[PDB]
Design a protein around this motif. Structure first.
Motif, mmCIF file in Angstrom:
data_model
loop_
_atom_site.group_PDB
_atom_site.id
_atom_site.type_symbol
_atom_site.label_atom_id
_atom_site.label_comp_id
_atom_site.label_asym_id
_atom_site.label_seq_id
_atom_site.Cartn_x
_atom_site.Cartn_y
_atom_site.Cartn_z
ATOM 1 N N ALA A 17 -9.240 1.691 5.373
ATOM 2 C CA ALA A 17 -8.726 0.548 4.592
ATOM 3 C C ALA A 17 -9.084 0.678 3.095
ATOM 4 O O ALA A 17 -8.659 -0.142 2.263
ATOM 5 C CB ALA A 17 -9.304 -0.736 5.164
ATOM 6 N N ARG A 18 -9.903 1.670 2.754
ATOM 7 C CA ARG A 18 -10.384 1.838 1.387
ATOM 8 C C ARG A 18 -9.285 2.439 0.502
ATOM 9 O O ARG A 18 -8.382 3.136 1.007
ATOM 10 C CB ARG A 18 -11.594 2.751 1.359
ATOM 11 C CG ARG A 18 -12.836 2.167 1.967
ATOM 12 C CD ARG A 18 -13.944 3.169 1.987
ATOM 13 N NE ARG A 18 -15.020 2.660 2.858
ATOM 14 C CZ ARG A 18 -15.932 3.430 3.435
ATOM 15 N NH1 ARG A 18 -15.951 4.757 3.206
ATOM 16 N NH2 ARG A 18 -16.828 2.865 4.228
ATOM 17 N N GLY A 19 -9.357 2.187 -0.800
ATOM 18 C CA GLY A 19 -8.315 2.641 -1.716
ATOM 19 C C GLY A 19 -7.584 1.486 -2.428
ATOM 20 O O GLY A 19 -7.951 0.291 -2.291
ATOM 21 N N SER A 20 -6.574 1.835 -3.222
ATOM 22 C CA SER A 20 -5.899 0.831 -4.053
ATOM 23 C C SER A 20 -4.669 0.239 -3.350
ATOM 24 O O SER A 20 -3.948 0.946 -2.619
ATOM 25 C CB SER A 20 -5.442 1.457 -5.404
ATOM 26 O OG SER A 20 -6.550 1.877 -6.195
ATOM 27 N N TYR A 21 -4.426 -1.037 -3.629
ATOM 28 C CA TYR A 21 -3.288 -1.804 -3.137
ATOM 29 C C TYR A 21 -2.641 -2.504 -4.322
ATOM 30 O O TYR A 21 -3.337 -2.888 -5.272
ATOM 31 C CB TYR A 21 -3.740 -2.922 -2.186
ATOM 32 C CG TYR A 21 -4.420 -2.407 -0.926
ATOM 33 C CD1 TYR A 21 -5.749 -1.962 -0.954
ATOM 34 C CD2 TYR A 21 -3.713 -2.332 0.295
ATOM 35 C CE1 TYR A 21 -6.370 -1.456 0.232
ATOM 36 C CE2 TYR A 21 -4.343 -1.845 1.462
ATOM 37 C CZ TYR A 21 -5.663 -1.439 1.413
ATOM 38 O OH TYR A 21 -6.231 -0.927 2.549
ATOM 39 N N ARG B 174 0.880 -1.172 0.000
ATOM 40 C CA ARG B 174 0.000 0.000 0.000
ATOM 41 C C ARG B 174 0.906 1.208 0.000
ATOM 42 O O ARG B 174 1.880 1.279 0.781
ATOM 43 C CB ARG B 174 -0.964 -0.014 1.192
ATOM 44 C CG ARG B 174 -2.003 1.161 1.044
ATOM 45 C CD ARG B 174 -2.904 1.265 2.201
ATOM 46 N NE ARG B 174 -4.066 2.126 1.889
ATOM 47 C CZ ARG B 174 -5.061 2.345 2.756
ATOM 48 N NH1 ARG B 174 -5.018 1.782 3.941
ATOM 49 N NH2 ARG B 174 -6.104 3.135 2.452
ATOM 50 N N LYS B 175 0.636 2.152 -0.911
ATOM 51 C CA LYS B 175 1.552 3.310 -1.063
ATOM 52 C C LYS B 175 3.017 2.889 -1.299
ATOM 53 O O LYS B 175 3.950 3.573 -0.848
ATOM 54 C CB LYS B 175 1.437 4.283 0.177
ATOM 55 C CG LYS B 175 0.018 4.509 0.880
ATOM 56 C CD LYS B 175 -1.041 5.270 -0.050
ATOM 57 C CE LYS B 175 -2.299 5.323 0.775
ATOM 58 N NZ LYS B 175 -3.787 5.685 0.059
ATOM 59 N N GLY B 176 3.224 1.724 -1.936
ATOM 60 C CA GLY B 176 4.574 1.211 -2.201
ATOM 61 C C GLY B 176 5.271 0.613 -1.006
ATOM 62 O O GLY B 176 6.464 0.261 -1.056
ATOM 63 N N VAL B 177 4.515 0.460 0.077
ATOM 64 C CA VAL B 177 5.044 -0.106 1.315
ATOM 65 C C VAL B 177 4.507 -1.529 1.496
ATOM 66 O O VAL B 177 3.286 -1.773 1.376
ATOM 67 C CB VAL B 177 4.668 0.768 2.520
ATOM 68 C CG1 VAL B 177 5.103 0.090 3.832
ATOM 69 C CG2 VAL B 177 5.259 2.201 2.348
ATOM 70 N N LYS B 178 5.417 -2.472 1.791
ATOM 71 C CA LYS B 178 5.059 -3.901 1.940
ATOM 72 C C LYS B 178 4.280 -4.076 3.220
ATOM 73 O O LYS B 178 4.770 -3.692 4.315
ATOM 74 C CB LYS B 178 6.324 -4.749 2.027
ATOM 75 C CG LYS B 178 6.036 -6.189 1.854
ATOM 76 C CD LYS B 178 7.199 -7.012 2.244
ATOM 77 C CE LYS B 178 6.767 -8.366 1.856
ATOM 78 N NZ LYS B 178 5.398 -8.094 1.388
ATOM 79 N N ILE B 179 3.058 -4.590 3.112
ATOM 80 C CA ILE B 179 2.198 -4.714 4.297
ATOM 81 C C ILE B 179 1.694 -6.144 4.548
ATOM 82 O O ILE B 179 1.250 -6.458 5.651
ATOM 83 C CB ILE B 179 1.001 -3.720 4.295
ATOM 84 C CG1 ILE B 179 0.082 -3.913 3.085
ATOM 85 C CG2 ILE B 179 1.475 -2.211 4.435
ATOM 86 C CD1 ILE B 179 -1.251 -3.148 3.306
#
Length: 138
Positions: free
Chosen positions: A107-111, A70-75
């Motif tokens: 939690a909404r938005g793109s991944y 998410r946002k280029g961060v590994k989650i």
């Protein structure tokens, strides 16, 4: 080549309540997916189905690995044991256990999702990238 031992052919998000099919053709241009996204309504149950064919030899310890950003961060990182499969013309379908889309405004938005299909030899049968967008509604 032209058809090597494993050919990964599709990814499908299996969701009873989705209004349309959520399918990637993995025999095609994999660069295309990076520019597309699947929408899931928040909180819904789904499974990921990977379709693949085996051409020549039994493969064992097949595994489907999925990394979520998410946002280029590994989650998130999940490994799924897929099994052993002999060669045949007909597609095999691997299905994950039921998963839940996350829920809530935060939690909404793109991944972004980095997927790999491999085995006990660590063979890169296919690696691809795709996107998932979590929404209040379909």
């Amino acid at each position: 080549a032209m058809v090597p031992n494993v050919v990964v052919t599709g990814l499908t998000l299996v969701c009873s309540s989705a209004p349309g099919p959520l399918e990637l053709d993995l025999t095609g241009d994999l660069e295309s997916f990076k520019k597309q996204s699947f929408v899931l309504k928040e909180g819904v149950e789904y499974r990921i189905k990977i379709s693949f064919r085996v051409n020549r030899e039994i493969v064992s310890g097949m595994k489907y690995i999925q990394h979520t950003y998410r946002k280029g961060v590994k989650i998130d990182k999940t490994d799924y044991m897929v099994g052993s499969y002999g060669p045949r013309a007909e597609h095999y379908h691997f299905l994950t256990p039921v998963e839940e889309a996350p829920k809530g405004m935060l939690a909404r938005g793109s991944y972004s999702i980095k997927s790999r299909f491999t085995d006990d030899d660590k063979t890169d049968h296919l690696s691809w990238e795709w996107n998932l967008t979590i929404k209040k509604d379909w």
